[PDB]
Amino acid sequence: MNKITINLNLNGEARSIVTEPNKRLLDLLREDFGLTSVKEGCSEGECGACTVIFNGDPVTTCCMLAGQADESTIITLEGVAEDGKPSLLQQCFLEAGAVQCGYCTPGMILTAKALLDKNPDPTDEEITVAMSGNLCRCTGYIKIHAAVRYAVERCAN
Amino acid sequence: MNKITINLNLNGEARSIVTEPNKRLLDLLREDFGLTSVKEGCSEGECGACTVIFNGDPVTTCCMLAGQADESTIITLEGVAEDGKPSLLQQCFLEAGAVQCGYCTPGMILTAKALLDKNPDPTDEEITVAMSGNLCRCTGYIKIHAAVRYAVERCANAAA
Amino acid sequence: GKDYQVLGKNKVKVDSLEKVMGTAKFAADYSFPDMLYAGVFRSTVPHARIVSLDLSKARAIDGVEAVLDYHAIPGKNRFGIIIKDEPCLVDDKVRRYGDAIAVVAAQTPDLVQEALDAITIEYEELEGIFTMERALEEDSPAIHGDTNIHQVKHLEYGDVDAAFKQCDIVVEDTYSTHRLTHMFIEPDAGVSYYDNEGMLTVVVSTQNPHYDRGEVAGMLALPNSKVRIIQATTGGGFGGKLDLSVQCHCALLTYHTKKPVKMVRSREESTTVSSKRHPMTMHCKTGATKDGRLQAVQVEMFGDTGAYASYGPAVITRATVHCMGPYVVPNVRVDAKFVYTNNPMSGAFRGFGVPQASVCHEGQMNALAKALGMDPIDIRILNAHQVGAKLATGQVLENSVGLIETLEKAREKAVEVMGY
Amino acid sequence: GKDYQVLGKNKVKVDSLEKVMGTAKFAADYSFPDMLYAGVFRSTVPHARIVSLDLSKARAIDGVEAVLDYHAIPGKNRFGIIIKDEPCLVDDKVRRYGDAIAVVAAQTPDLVQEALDAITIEYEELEGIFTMERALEEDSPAIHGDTNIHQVKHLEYGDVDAAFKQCDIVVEDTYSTHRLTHMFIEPDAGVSYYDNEGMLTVVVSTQNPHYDRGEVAGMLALPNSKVRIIQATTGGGFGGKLDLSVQCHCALLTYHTKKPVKMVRSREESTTVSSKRHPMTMHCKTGATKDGRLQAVQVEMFGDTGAYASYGPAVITRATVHCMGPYVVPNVRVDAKFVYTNNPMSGAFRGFGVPQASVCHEGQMNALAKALGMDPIDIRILNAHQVGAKLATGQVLENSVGLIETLEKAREKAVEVMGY
Ligand SMILES: Nc1ccn([C@@H]2O[C@H](COP(=O)(O)OP(=O)(O)OC[C@H]3Oc4nc5nc(N)nc(O)c5nc4C(S)=C3S)[C@@H](O)[C@H]2O)c(=O)n1
Ligand code: FES
Ligand code: FES
Ligand code: FES
Ligand code: FES
Ligand SMILES: [Ca+2]
Ligand SMILES: [Mg+2]
Ligand SMILES: [Mg+2]
Ligand SMILES: [Se]
Ligand SMILES: [Se]
């Protein structure tokens, strides 16, 4: 097995790394790039905790091989903050009560951001289906959704 | 400036590193090898806090270029412990009250050890001269010297 | 109401910022220099004796720093949140599937798994008990001690044998609740190490750091003050993280290698090893009169606490005391028995045996409400607890009782939203 | 003497283990991911206004993240252990050599130095004051406010004018001590950062973390509960690490870059910038009768507090309260005047003015003993403080007074070991 060269745009910057391909994209991000916001809750693509914005689209990084992130644009929770400050979405999650244990939060926010970056004014239903790939055992999903609805409204102005 | 390859035996094991030559051995040990026990109290050879055992002799690492550690055997405080436990000498510093702020201690212990590895039963005068390159602002040296003397006696004691 | 400065207000939580920013670190997010990785070699049988265990080939792998069994423990090898019947590493015998037999520490996760697949073991299987029936048989093989009867409680209030004669209605039925798992989104994780000052420390996903401290200190024979447990940001527990998970296994390895030991359970191993809700069966008979006032409740329940006690003693006790819903019952009889089995360890899960008990009594009430043409709410409001009432334990409610309000306000809201 | 369970015993220190093992971490031994290095651009003139300051060229260097002057501080820019007369970064004017003017944060120590070398500045030099004589001349520029007089104290006890007339012997001499530096073996060092939960933090070599905190919080306009100061294993202080060293410069650079900022001072800069012992000159007249009994002490002293107050207040009063020595003197008068100068900042150095005072009172006692042909120890035992003695401040000693025992034990030992 020979190491492969991987070029990608991670959190707004052009990165490049030569490493062994025998690993998942989740491992690459957590271990090689130190992005620990990307959680691993099941290892089978179910919980969504390992969700990251892969080319405008959210994806389960526990289902992808490191090499597949080549030539792609990836955004993890660390990339959401604006110059170290909580974005609008993040602020809404804070005030809405959408956060209990916080293990699912990164994925939730990334899924909600991916959505809002395509559909600024989504329907509550479009919001639901949009985040149906992320499981939470704490909130019942209610207040998480409210935070998204909250953000959209403040997005109007 | 081309990088150089430095081969040395560090704390018992053969290490090898390819690095820039424009750094002191003190920097190599602290930064590249993570041995923070090696202190920088003055940068000019006076305090002895950056002392390491070099090919059997105590030397001030702030006075040396990294490449000069090539083909050498070096022992820092981290390499004195025996299986994660305090060596006899270290146990003696603990008990003799030789430790106050503890900043000059790595140097004191290494200098003491360097002496004992050569001369297991030194005279008090020999102990003093041997450690005269290490400055301390807390102890007044009294108990640091006692610790070494105590180690020498307990070592002989181990004549069972 | 009752004007408060900050109380009641929806203040942004003190730990939400780091959670939404992604800087918050859960156990598995921690990494240290020279940090080794750990894995646990567990049993594949449910009940047996270890005839032969070979760790020689595992240890011989270049990259594996340690492989240990119970012999490696300097202190005690019996733990438990209530009853010390849980080993850190099987010594006595295997009492369940996934029992901790040995632990490994290596430089990489794969080297951990490699060292694990190299271990061989021989079993002398016993009769794996899986039903409460076979477990009660004075004939069955004792999983613990000389009996499979873990807990037995009996509550007697007033005289039910009599009251059951002053009732115009009496309903009997058997209830049964299944086995469930907390399923917190964050799998079990922990990391142990000796800090810069020599302090043995364990960062871990837990619900009770201080309890964990005692066990670790016990295992290593160290005074509590010399063992530090740091409850890291925890991704849910719901009761599944009260029992020990990786604390002792990590600490044990850090004790022997003196290096940091990280252990992150896969979802599979996490679910396989953690405790489960107590599956229960409850035989009940409630007697009431025309008007609807309850006169006497009688219950006989059983419980499958699993291979180990865990919160079993607390589950049976709390269940016994609540089996007769939040209603005033002048006569109560309760017989409860929990037994050890080779089924997954039963312990604490949101409710402490009350959810199971709620099904039983609420099932009866709704049953009486159906046999008396009463509205499920009213028949409840009638027998609802109030300040001054007397409990099956002889205790009298002296304050904070808003059960009827939850019944009226709720019904009201239901009407407004679902047309009650 | 009281059978203590553990008190008095030569117990191994709770922190000696890390020190002998080399694991103990002093501030400079800390390193964090993405950590930047910092340096300070300091004045090379003693007293002057800044005409111009160019930071553009320093900012343009690839690898330099920040180059800040006082304009970058969001909160206050006046600090001080006792008197808030010290800036974090000079605003109105330079008052000493080595005054902090701007700070730099960069990816490497070499980049920092490169940034400092690229900063240019133009001063409008004022008169540098280096003598207390010139400082007291009212036409001399005022380093602070409208006068260079920093502190004044006067102790009046009994009546020395009357007393001196009743004396058989009076010794009068002018004493003076010099300027010294602490020279702890570990140079000033610190590192700041926001932790995982967003907590602003500063790990530093200090003697007073809680004081440090209040200052940092005040600079960043934050509540004290939101600024964490962690005193790292400290390589000695002796008073020189009471004043702020790197805490604010680091915290400020972290507040702006949001990254960890490490600042380790070269021995040179540490000495140049840290406090020094107050040099003092004491004029004393001490009177006594033939039997060697003290009747009156009169001291007129001056202290050079340097550019900033630091412990100037603490030093002048402590020195004033003790300058008659550990002796019962029924009549004492003390005049003390400490002045600001552009000399290095005088602060706290083991003794707070008493070492300087003792040179005086002991010099007097020895001249008395010699002239009266008495044994130096005897003349001291005769006038020594004892429980019950009345102090020059009106205070009467009520307990714990063993001066005579030190005197006797000391002489007894010296007779034996040095032939006293
Ligand atoms: N009068 C009250 C009561 C509760 N609360 C809120 O609700 C929480 C629950 O408080 P409490 O009922 O006192 O229970 P504990 O804090 O002791 O939490 C443990 C409890 O919490 C439960 N809910 C959980 N919620 C989350 N997010 N994660 C778990 O693991 C949970 N596990 C369960 C289980 S099981 C248990 S035993 C408080 O932190 C508080 O934010 C409140 O504001 N005012
Ligand atoms: S770990 Fe990827 S979806 Fe759960
Ligand atoms: S808040 Fe805990 S899993 Fe979502
Ligand atoms: S730093 Fe090397 S002798 Fe002082
Ligand atoms: S113990 Fe502090 S310098 Fe030696
Ligand atoms: Ca626990
Ligand atoms: Mg300080
Ligand atoms: Mg001063
Ligand atoms: Se629970
Ligand atoms: Se001091």
Side-chain angles (χ1 to χ4, degrees):
Chain A
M1 174 182 84
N2 310 310
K3 293 185 176 184
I4 59 175
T5 302
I6 302 176
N7 305 294
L8 73 174
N9 175 286
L10 182 58
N11 291 304
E13 55 188 59
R15 302 298 293 288
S16 177
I17 181 175
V18 182
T19 177
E20 297 82 297
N22 58 324
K23 65 175 73 170
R24 305 165 301 170
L25 179 49
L26 161 62
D27 300 308
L28 184 79
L29 297 183
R30 283 183 65 71
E31 300 306 312
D32 296 286
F33 292 109
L35 295 176
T36 58
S37 73
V38 192
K39 312 304 177 193
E40 162 159 32
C42 65
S43 312
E44 47 169 47
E46 296 278 356
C47 68
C50 75
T51 299
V52 305
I53 303 182
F54 189 62
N55 296 148
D57 298 298
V59 303
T60 51
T61 58
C62 70
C63 305
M64 311 167 68
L65 249 56
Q68 293 185 285
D70 183 50
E71 296 186 63
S72 67
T73 300
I74 297 173
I75 299 177
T76 70
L77 187 52
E78 292 91 330
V80 180
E82 281 147 44
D83 59 60
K85 291 301 184 301
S87 57
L88 176 64
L89 186 57
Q90 294 175 310
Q91 190 65 45
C92 289
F93 260 77
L94 288 183
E95 299 176 47
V99 180
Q100 274 192 51
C101 94
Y103 200 63
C104 73
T105 313
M108 293 289 179
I109 290 176
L110 293 176
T111 293
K113 168 181 160 61
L115 167 63
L116 297 187
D117 275 314
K118 294 181 181 178
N119 188 16
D121 206 312
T123 65
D124 287 43
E125 182 64 48
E126 294 181 297
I127 291 177
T128 294
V129 184
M131 297 172 78
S132 54
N134 295 276
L135 293 170
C136 171
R137 188 63 160 176
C138 300
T139 65
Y141 306 107
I142 300 302
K143 295 188 180 301
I144 294 186
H145 188 285
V148 184
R149 195 71 259 168
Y150 199 66
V152 182
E153 298 322 313
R154 294 170 66 181
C155 261
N157 309 54
Chain B
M1 170 182 78
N2 293 301
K3 291 186 181 184
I4 60 176
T5 308
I6 297 173
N7 293 297
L8 75 165
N9 184 283
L10 183 62
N11 289 319
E13 57 185 55
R15 305 300 297 282
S16 192
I17 179 177
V18 173
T19 182
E20 305 74 46
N22 65 324
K23 64 177 62 165
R24 312 165 292 164
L25 172 50
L26 165 55
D27 310 301
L28 180 73
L29 299 171
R30 282 185 64 77
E31 293 306 312
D32 298 291
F33 289 114
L35 306 170
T36 61
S37 78
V38 184
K39 316 306 187 184
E40 175 159 26
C42 77
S43 311
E44 70 177 324
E46 305 275 336
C47 80
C50 69
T51 295
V52 302
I53 310 187
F54 186 73
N55 296 153
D57 316 315
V59 298
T60 36
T61 56
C62 65
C63 298
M64 313 165 79
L65 261 43
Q68 296 188 299
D70 187 52
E71 310 194 77
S72 73
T73 297
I74 292 174
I75 296 177
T76 63
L77 185 53
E78 290 89 344
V80 177
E82 281 146 35
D83 61 61
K85 297 299 190 302
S87 69
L88 170 65
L89 180 63
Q90 289 168 309
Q91 184 61 44
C92 284
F93 269 67
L94 290 178
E95 298 171 24
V99 183
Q100 276 190 47
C101 83
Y103 198 74
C104 72
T105 305
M108 296 285 180
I109 292 176
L110 292 175
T111 297
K113 164 181 171 51
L115 171 72
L116 302 181
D117 289 342
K118 288 176 187 170
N119 173 26
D121 210 330
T123 63
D124 275 5
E125 179 70 41
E126 301 180 318
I127 292 175
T128 299
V129 176
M131 297 179 76
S132 65
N134 293 269
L135 297 177
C136 184
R137 189 61 149 171
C138 305
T139 71
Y141 311 98
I142 301 298
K143 295 182 186 299
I144 297 179
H145 186 291
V148 182
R149 168 49 66 201
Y150 186 34
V152 178
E153 297 307 294
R154 288 186 60 169
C155 183
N157 218 61
Chain C
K2 197 167 186 177
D3 191 53
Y4 282 119
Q5 168 188 164
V6 286
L7 234 65
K9 294 184 170 190
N10 308 311
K11 290 288 187 177
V12 182
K13 295 176 60 188
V14 304
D15 58 331
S16 286
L17 177 57
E18 59 272 28
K19 290 179 180 184
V20 304
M21 296 303 275
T23 63
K25 285 184 175 170
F26 293 79
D29 298 316
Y30 286 89
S31 289
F32 297 108
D34 299 314
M35 177 185 78
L36 298 192
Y37 293 87
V40 177
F41 175 85
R42 300 165 182 295
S43 62
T44 50
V45 299
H47 197 188
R49 194 182 313 301
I50 300 178
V51 171
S52 177
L53 185 63
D54 182 49
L55 311 169
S56 63
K57 296 176 296 179
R59 290 163 177 159
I61 298 177
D62 190 9
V64 174
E65 305 303 305
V67 181
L68 322 170
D69 53 32
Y70 75 107
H71 296 291
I73 300 172
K76 67 173 186 178
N77 186 35
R78 279 294 180 286
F79 311 85
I81 190 66
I82 296 180
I83 307 299
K84 301 303 186 189
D85 54 15
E86 299 177 56
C88 164
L89 293 176
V90 176
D91 61 326
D92 189 343
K93 66 172 181 184
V94 177
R95 299 187 172 70
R96 63 160 178 178
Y97 181 82
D99 241 351
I101 290 183
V103 294
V104 180
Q107 302 166 182
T108 66
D110 288 308
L111 283 167
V112 170
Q113 186 67 62
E114 195 188 318
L116 289 171
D117 303 322
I119 304 181
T120 63
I121 185 170
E122 195 176 3
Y123 302 124
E124 182 189 62
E125 303 196 61
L126 301 182
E127 192 191 316
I129 307 172
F130 299 113
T131 65
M132 295 191 269
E133 301 61 59
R134 175 50 180 167
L136 286 170
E137 286 182 53
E138 299 292 357
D139 177 55
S140 65
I143 302 180
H144 285 291
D146 55 60
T147 174
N148 288 304
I149 293 183
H150 177 211
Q151 292 302 86
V152 182
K153 300 291 186 185
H154 175 65
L155 177 167
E156 184 63 57
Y157 181 56
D159 181 302
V160 299
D161 291 311
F164 272 123
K165 303 177 181 180
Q166 302 297 301
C167 304
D168 294 298
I169 177 62
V170 174
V171 300
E172 311 178 307
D173 281 298
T174 297
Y175 295 94
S176 188
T177 56
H178 56 306
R179 195 186 309 290
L180 303 75
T181 190
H182 319 81
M183 201 52 74
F184 23 73
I185 312 307
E186 165 199 49
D188 299 296
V191 179
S192 61
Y193 56 92
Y194 280 112
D195 70 22
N196 294 310
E197 292 81 40
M199 171 80 100
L200 173 71
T201 316
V202 181
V203 173
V204 63
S205 181
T206 171
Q207 308 187 197
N208 46 179
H210 284 72
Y211 154 68
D212 305 331
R213 181 181 64 180
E215 306 294 56
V216 179
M219 169 190 75
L220 299 170
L222 282 173
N224 288 196
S225 59
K226 295 309 159 179
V227 175
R228 179 180 196 177
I229 305 297
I230 295 173
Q231 186 239 320
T233 304
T234 305
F238 307 106
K241 294 177 185 172
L242 283 166
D243 306 284
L244 304 177
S245 66
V246 295
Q247 296 90 328
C248 291
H249 291 163
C250 282
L252 179 68
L253 281 160
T254 280
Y255 169 76
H256 280 287
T257 70
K258 304 187 187 65
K259 304 179 186 173
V261 168
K262 180 176 189 173
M263 188 173 273
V264 176
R265 282 183 185 164
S266 56
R267 170 57 64 179
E268 187 165 58
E269 176 179 41
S270 170
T271 305
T272 302
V273 170
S274 50
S275 67
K276 301 293 174 301
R277 186 186 289 293
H278 276 68
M280 298 168 75
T281 60
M282 309 150 257
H283 299 305
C284 193
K285 181 181 182 179
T286 314
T289 48
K290 306 176 296 298
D291 56 306
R293 290 183 181 297
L294 306 171
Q295 292 307 311
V297 183
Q298 185 168 298
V299 176
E300 187 185 307
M301 55 186 110
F302 302 110
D304 185 347
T305 201
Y308 303 100
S310 184
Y311 270 100
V315 178
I316 185 172
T317 300
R318 179 179 288 279
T320 291
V321 181
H322 292 78
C323 61
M324 86 308 278
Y327 316 113
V328 186
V329 182
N331 302 295
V332 185
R333 172 161 303 190
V334 184
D335 296 300
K337 187 178 303 177
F338 276 33
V339 303
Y340 287 117
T341 67
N342 291 85
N343 286 165
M345 177 179 94
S346 298
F349 191 157
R350 198 175 197 171
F352 262 171
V354 168
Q356 303 92 300
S358 72
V359 177
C360 180
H361 66 244
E362 287 312 79
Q364 294 290 76
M365 289 302 280
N366 278 171
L368 286 181
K370 190 186 186 64
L372 303 180
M374 298 176 86
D375 179 57
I377 294 297
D378 298 299
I379 189 172
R380 280 182 168 64
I381 302 182
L382 187 61
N383 293 290
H385 285 180
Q386 308 183 191
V387 170
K390 190 180 183 62
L391 287 52
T393 65
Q395 190 191 318
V396 60
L397 297 180
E398 291 183 40
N399 61 60
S400 183
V401 186
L403 174 54
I404 300 180
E405 197 176 310
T406 64
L407 285 164
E408 309 172 307
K409 292 292 176 57
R411 175 179 60 189
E412 178 176 52
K413 198 65 182 183
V415 169
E416 182 189 302
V417 303
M418 61 173 78
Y420 189 66
Chain D
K2 296 179 179 181
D3 179 61
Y4 294 124
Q5 155 184 164
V6 292
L7 221 73
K9 294 186 176 182
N10 308 326
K11 289 295 185 182
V12 169
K13 298 171 68 191
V14 306
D15 64 332
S16 280
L17 182 66
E18 321 91 80
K19 298 179 181 186
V20 302
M21 298 306 274
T23 61
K25 288 194 172 296
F26 292 79
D29 305 328
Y30 282 79
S31 297
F32 300 97
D34 302 303
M35 168 184 84
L36 303 179
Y37 296 82
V40 181
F41 178 79
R42 300 175 177 283
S43 76
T44 53
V45 291
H47 199 189
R49 278 185 283 279
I50 298 177
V51 183
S52 62
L53 177 61
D54 182 31
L55 309 182
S56 68
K57 289 183 292 187
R59 285 164 167 162
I61 298 175
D62 201 296
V64 182
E65 314 289 302
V67 178
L68 325 165
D69 62 18
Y70 79 101
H71 293 293
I73 298 171
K76 55 188 170 64
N77 187 40
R78 277 303 182 286
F79 310 87
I81 193 74
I82 306 180
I83 303 302
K84 306 301 184 184
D85 68 341
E86 292 173 69
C88 172
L89 289 175
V90 166
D91 42 27
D92 65 331
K93 71 163 170 175
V94 166
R95 296 184 167 74
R96 60 168 177 165
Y97 177 90
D99 243 341
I101 297 174
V103 292
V104 172
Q107 311 195 191
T108 67
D110 281 314
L111 290 175
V112 164
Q113 193 53 60
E114 200 183 317
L116 298 172
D117 291 333
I119 298 179
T120 65
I121 187 178
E122 178 183 353
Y123 307 96
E124 195 202 318
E125 292 187 59
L126 301 181
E127 172 178 18
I129 300 181
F130 303 109
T131 61
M132 293 188 269
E133 294 56 60
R134 176 52 171 155
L136 292 180
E137 279 170 29
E138 195 44 54
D139 70 338
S140 71
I143 299 170
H144 293 282
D146 54 31
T147 181
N148 286 314
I149 292 176
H150 171 227
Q151 296 272 119
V152 180
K153 301 291 176 174
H154 182 83
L155 185 160
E156 188 66 39
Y157 181 61
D159 187 331
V160 289
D161 295 303
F164 284 115
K165 289 161 66 178
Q166 319 320 329
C167 297
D168 300 306
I169 173 65
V170 176
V171 290
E172 205 174 328
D173 264 303
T174 290
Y175 299 82
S176 79
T177 54
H178 51 312
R179 193 187 315 293
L180 299 88
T181 201
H182 311 72
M183 203 60 81
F184 23 75
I185 307 311
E186 172 206 28
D188 301 292
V191 186
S192 57
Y193 56 89
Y194 284 101
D195 64 20
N196 301 317
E197 300 83 49
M199 170 75 93
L200 185 61
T201 309
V202 187
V203 173
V204 66
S205 184
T206 182
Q207 311 185 202
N208 47 171
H210 284 79
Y211 158 74
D212 299 342
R213 175 231 257 163
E215 300 286 55
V216 166
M219 172 189 74
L220 299 185
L222 295 164
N224 277 280
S225 67
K226 306 300 176 178
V227 176
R228 186 185 194 181
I229 303 292
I230 300 174
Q231 186 226 347
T233 305
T234 300
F238 307 101
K241 287 177 181 170
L242 289 167
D243 310 278
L244 285 169
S245 59
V246 308
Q247 298 92 328
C248 283
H249 290 150
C250 285
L252 178 65
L253 279 174
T254 288
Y255 167 82
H256 277 297
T257 68
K258 294 180 182 64
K259 299 179 179 182
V261 177
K262 182 175 183 175
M263 192 179 295
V264 177
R265 290 186 178 162
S266 65
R267 163 60 59 183
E268 181 175 65
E269 176 176 37
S270 172
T271 302
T272 296
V273 170
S274 63
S275 73
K276 302 286 166 273
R277 187 185 290 286
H278 283 73
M280 303 168 54
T281 63
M282 304 140 284
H283 303 298
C284 192
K285 188 182 176 183
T286 304
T289 46
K290 290 190 301 297
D291 59 357
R293 281 179 176 292
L294 298 170
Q295 296 308 319
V297 171
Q298 186 165 296
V299 174
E300 170 181 39
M301 63 182 139
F302 300 93
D304 186 337
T305 213
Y308 303 98
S310 186
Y311 282 91
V315 177
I316 190 172
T317 93
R318 187 174 270 279
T320 290
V321 172
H322 300 76
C323 76
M324 65 295 303
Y327 316 113
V328 187
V329 190
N331 305 281
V332 188
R333 174 174 298 155
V334 182
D335 280 294
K337 180 176 287 167
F338 272 36
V339 313
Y340 279 116
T341 73
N342 299 116
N343 277 128
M345 179 177 79
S346 289
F349 195 157
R350 204 175 195 172
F352 273 142
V354 184
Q356 305 92 311
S358 72
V359 166
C360 176
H361 65 238
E362 290 316 85
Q364 292 296 78
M365 297 304 264
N366 284 143
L368 281 180
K370 180 167 141 53
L372 295 184
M374 303 180 80
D375 170 66
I377 288 299
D378 285 335
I379 192 166
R380 290 176 166 74
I381 293 186
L382 176 61
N383 293 289
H385 280 188
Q386 300 190 191
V387 167
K390 193 181 187 61
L391 270 32
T393 67
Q395 176 179 21
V396 53
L397 295 170
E398 291 168 43
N399 63 73
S400 187
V401 174
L403 173 57
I404 289 174
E405 194 179 311
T406 65
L407 294 168
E408 298 174 309
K409 292 284 182 57
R411 180 170 63 181
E412 175 185 56
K413 190 66 180 181
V415 167
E416 172 203 306
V417 309
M418 70 178 80
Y420 190 95

Coordinates of all heavy atoms in Angstrom, one line a residue, chain C residues 182 207 237-240 242 277 311 347-352, ligand 9:
Chain C
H182 N -30.3 2.4 26.8 CA -30.3 3.9 26.8 C -30.0 4.5 25.4 O -30.6 5.5 25.1 CB -29.2 4.3 27.7 CG -29.2 3.5 29.0 ND1 -28.6 2.3 29.2 CD2 -29.8 3.8 30.2 CE1 -28.9 1.8 30.4 NE2 -29.6 2.7 31.0
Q207 N -21.7 9.6 34.9 CA -22.8 10.4 35.5 C -22.5 10.6 37.0 O -23.1 11.4 37.7 CB -24.1 9.6 35.4 CG -24.4 9.1 34.0 CD -25.8 8.5 33.9 OE1 -26.1 7.8 32.9 NE2 -26.6 8.7 34.9
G237 N -26.5 10.0 29.0 CA -26.3 8.8 29.9 C -27.6 8.1 30.1 O -27.7 6.9 30.0
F238 N -28.6 8.8 30.6 CA -29.9 8.3 30.8 C -29.9 7.1 31.7 O -30.8 6.3 31.7 CB -30.6 7.9 29.5 CG -30.6 9.0 28.5 CD1 -29.7 9.0 27.4 CD2 -31.4 10.1 28.7 CE1 -29.7 10.1 26.5 CE2 -31.4 11.2 27.8 CZ -30.6 11.2 26.7
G239 N -28.8 7.0 32.6 CA -28.7 5.9 33.5 C -27.7 4.9 33.1 O -27.2 4.1 33.9
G240 N -27.3 4.8 31.8 CA -26.4 3.8 31.3 C -24.9 4.1 31.7 O -24.1 3.3 31.4
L242 N -23.8 5.1 34.9 CA -23.7 5.2 36.3 C -22.7 4.0 36.7 O -21.9 4.2 37.7 CB -25.0 5.0 37.0 CG -26.0 6.2 37.0 CD1 -27.4 5.7 37.4 CD2 -25.4 7.2 38.0
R277 N -32.5 -1.8 30.8 CA -33.7 -1.6 31.7 C -34.2 -3.0 32.1 O -34.1 -4.0 31.4 CB -34.8 -0.9 30.9 CG -36.0 -0.6 31.9 CD -37.2 0.0 31.1 NE -36.9 1.4 30.6 CZ -36.8 2.5 31.4 NH1 -36.8 2.4 32.7 NH2 -36.6 3.7 30.8
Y311 N -28.1 -1.6 39.5 CA -29.1 -0.9 40.2 C -30.3 -1.7 40.6 O -31.3 -1.2 41.0 CB -29.5 0.4 39.4 CG -28.7 1.6 39.8 CD1 -27.6 2.0 38.9 CD2 -28.9 2.3 40.9 CE1 -26.8 3.1 39.3 CE2 -28.1 3.4 41.3 CZ -27.1 3.8 40.4 OH -26.3 4.8 40.8
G347 N -29.8 -2.7 34.9 CA -29.5 -1.7 35.9 C -30.4 -0.5 36.0 O -31.6 -0.6 36.3
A348 N -29.8 0.7 35.8 CA -30.6 1.9 35.8 C -30.8 2.5 34.4 O -29.9 2.6 33.6 CB -29.8 2.9 36.6
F349 N -32.1 2.8 34.2 CA -32.5 3.4 32.9 C -33.7 4.3 33.2 O -34.7 3.8 33.8 CB -32.9 2.3 31.9 CG -33.1 2.8 30.5 CD1 -33.0 1.9 29.4 CD2 -33.4 4.1 30.2 CE1 -33.2 2.3 28.1 CE2 -33.7 4.5 28.9 CZ -33.5 3.7 27.9
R350 N -33.6 5.5 32.9 CA -34.6 6.6 33.1 C -35.9 6.1 33.6 O -36.8 5.6 32.9 CB -34.8 7.4 31.8 CG -35.5 8.7 32.0 CD -35.5 9.5 30.7 NE -35.8 10.9 30.9 CZ -35.7 11.8 29.9 NH1 -35.4 11.4 28.7 NH2 -36.0 13.1 30.2
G351 N -36.1 6.1 35.0 CA -37.3 5.6 35.5 C -37.1 4.8 36.8 O -38.0 4.7 37.6
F352 N -36.0 4.1 36.9 CA -35.7 3.2 38.0 C -36.9 2.2 38.3 O -37.2 2.0 39.4 CB -35.5 4.0 39.3 CG -34.1 4.3 39.6 CD1 -33.7 5.2 40.6 CD2 -33.1 3.6 38.9 CE1 -32.4 5.4 40.9 CE2 -31.7 3.8 39.3 CZ -31.4 4.7 40.3
Ligands
SE9 SE -31.8 5.9 35.1

